Design a protein around this ligand. Structure first.
Ligand SMILES: O=c1ccn([C@@H]2O[C@H](COP(=O)(O)OP(=O)(O)O)[C@@H](O)[C@H]2O)c(=O)[nH]1
Ligand SMILES: NC(=[NH2+])NCCC[C@H](N)C(=O)O
Length: 303
């Protein structure tokens, strides 16, 4: 079609054409279980992820493919990627540290003390003292820990899947203009403030994707098992840099102690923007926001 309507509000279908890079990501918790001249990206029987990205890139030789990487990498491991970039020159390896996220950041001192004030400003006969006393100990712990400790820093390699699911959302905020910001070659063909398409390393390209259309230019993976639907970070595709729905999620991260990429940023951000006030069912959002493509065998890590 040409559009779709949700909550009584109308939403046009926006193009994501074959310029639009596929993004993969690998945040490797440990680099030293790899050879120091091995591409520090996992390619094993249960998940041969390094095979699923190349084959993706081969199926799409004339669309850019980004590999969003992060980990304390040996010089030789960085040149394993280097060989990978010249041996296939649509592939663009991008180091997390080569991007500046300061414009999207916040200090937990700030974030906590905000909530401390909000709660203390409410009726004592109404307020969440249980929470009121947790954010102050979180406060108590960050002071002693480190004055200038922020959201972005917190969600570190130590913090497991919050490491890579947090920075993912940041990446997409920066979108296609991030190929430029690290300095990656032969990316002049990317449009400004342009979108991207993240992929779990395990969503398998089979055949060409083509030119995607979305409600307001955003879609995400939705799980459907067996009797269940969820929204997933397995696929994320936007049509531009700093899409609002994710922007709102970045705000909810700034305005909540203990925000979470999955529940707060991704999930509630999308849905508050799309459904600020909850007129449509959750599922009827999941359907409205679902990313459909027949040429990808979705989320093959469950097998
Ligand atoms: O050590 C890891 C493990 C996972 N991932 C990311 O998590 C995504 C999906 O992970 P997987 O399918 O293995 O786990 P699931 O979330 O499906 O259980 C991958 O594409 C990666 O982007 C990562 O960056 N580093
Ligand atoms: N974003 C994702 N696709 N996450 C994984 C969801 C499926 C999960 N691997 C399972 O056990 O079924």
């Amino acid at each position: 079609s040409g559009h779709v309507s949700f909550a009584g509000i109308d939403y046009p279908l926006l193009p994501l054409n074959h310029q639009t890079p596929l993004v993969f990501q690998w945040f490797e918790r440990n680099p030293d279980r790899f050879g120091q001249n091995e591409i520090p990206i996992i390619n094993t029987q249960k998940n041969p992820y390094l095979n699923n990205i190349i084959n993706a890139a081969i199926i799409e030789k004339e669309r850019i493919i980004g590999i969003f990487v992060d980990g304390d990498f040996s010089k030789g491991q960085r040149k394993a990627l280097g060989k990978l970039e010249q041996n296939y020159r649509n592939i663009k390896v991008i180091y997390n540290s080569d991007l500046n996220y300061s414009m999207y950041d916040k200090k937990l001192t700030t974030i906590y003390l905000e909530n401390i004030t909000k709660l203390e400003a409410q009726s004592a006969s109404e307020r969440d003292e249980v929470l009121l006393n947790g954010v102050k100990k979180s406060l108590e712990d960050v002071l002693k820990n480190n004055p200038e400790e922020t959201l972005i820093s917190s969600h570190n390699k130590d913090k497991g899947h919050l490491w890579f699911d947090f920075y993912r959302n940041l990446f997409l905020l920066k979108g296609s203009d991030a190929f430029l910001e690290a300095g990656k070659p032969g990316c002049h063909h990317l449009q400004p403030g342009g979108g991207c398409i993240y992929l779990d390393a395990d969503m398998l390209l089979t055949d060409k994707l083509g030119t995607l259309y979305l409600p307001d230019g955003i879609a995400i993976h939705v799980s459907r098992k067996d009797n269940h639907v969820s929204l997933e970070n397995g696929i994320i595709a936007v049509n531009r840099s700093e899409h609002p729905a994710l922007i709102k999620g970045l705000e909810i991260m700034h305005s909540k102690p203990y925000g979470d990429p999955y529940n707060d940023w991704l999930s509630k951000g999308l849905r508050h923007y799309f459904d600020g006030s909850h007129i449509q069912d959750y599922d009827a959002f999941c359907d409205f926001i679902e990313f459909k493509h027949e040429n990808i065998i979705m989320n093959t890590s469950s097998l």
